[model samples]
Target: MQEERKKLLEKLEKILDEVTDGAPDEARERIEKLAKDVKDELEEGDAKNMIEKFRDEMEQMYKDAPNAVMEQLLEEIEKLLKKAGSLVPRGSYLEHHHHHH
Candidate 1:
């Protein structure tokens, strides 16, 4: 479990880095793929629970992931969410943005 968690976090970090560093198109594409991979990796219940848990941890990591890292990631994500024709992954919040707003 520990090893798996560590691997997952490592992947998440890498994805976040990509999210921050790439062009908007690249970041959006990579993040969508990463989100799908994550959604496919867990059971429905587990995914729900894990996402909730991850939010707290993500918030912490968002602050701690220095070099303005997570902020850039989350910032781009927010921008993508607000865009007119953005394509967010199935499980991502951006996927629902169109519906809400």
Candidate 2:
């Protein structure tokens, strides 16, 4: 449990670094702050709400329309969250293999 979450921190940081290239200063700073919050939550062993909030924010962007680069940024993070362990938000991801669909 402990080691997995630590690995999640490292992975999350890498994702953060990768996504910021085409982002604006405002977006960059927001993500930076979000990452910090995620980091703290990771150390405490839960980043659920932070990630969920981020997803909701990204959905707003989708409505407003972010570029493909920004779109990918959110997708990759969602992928990583699934990779790290158990994170099934919305039955969106939940619709996949389990939940006895």
Query: Over the full model, what C-alpha lDDT does candidate 2 score relative to the true structure?
Result: 0.59
Per-model TM-score versus the true fold: 0.30, 0.60
- Please, what is the whole-model Cα lDDT of each candidate in the order they appear? 0.42, 0.59
**Which digits, one per residue and each the tens of the lDDT, describe model 1 over residues 1-101?**
54355455455545445643542442345345545554554544354333333333334444433345555655543433233122524324312112221
The deviation in Å at residue 71 for candidate 1 is 1.5
Give residue 27's error in model 1 in angstroms: 20
- Candidate with top TM-score is 2
Name the runs in model 1 displaced over 4 angstroms.
1-41, 75-101
**Residue 18 of candidate 2: its Cα lDDT?**
55
TM-score of 2: 0.60
